[PDB]
Amino acid sequence: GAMAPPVAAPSPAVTYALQEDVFIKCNDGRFYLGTIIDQTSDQYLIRFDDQSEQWCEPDKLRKLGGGSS
């Protein structure tokens, strides 16, 4: 989804910086910690600990230390 991913919350609008670790939820419910390598306005390319790169929507990403953005 773009801007409004399917969640139990309104339309998320969060941004992240590259080279930053964030937790990513997969549809199975598990969260995988990964490092952001690229961003778009709709998704963030996360390179996980397993070095896989996936475009994850902003709803899947959670900040490690609160985040000011």
Side-chain angles (χ1 to χ4, degrees):
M3 182 182 299
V7 287
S11 307
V14 285
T15 188
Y16 298 80
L18 308 184
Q19 306 178 29
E20 185 62 67
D21 292 293
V22 284
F23 283 102
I24 282 62
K25 169 183 174 179
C26 190
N27 186 30
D28 181 62
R30 277 65 190 215
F31 270 97
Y32 296 86
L33 186 57
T35 314
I36 310 178
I37 51 274
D38 194 50
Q39 60 164 29
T40 58
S41 306
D42 69 302
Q43 292 176 90
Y44 293 82
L45 189 59
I46 315 301
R47 180 165 177 126
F48 295 89
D49 180 92
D50 178 82
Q51 302 301 274
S52 300
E53 289 168 55
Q54 179 181 29
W55 287 101
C56 307
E57 288 157 72
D59 74 290
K60 300 302 183 304
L61 294 136
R62 309 307 305 131
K63 293 71 171 296
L64 301 188
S68 305
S69 304

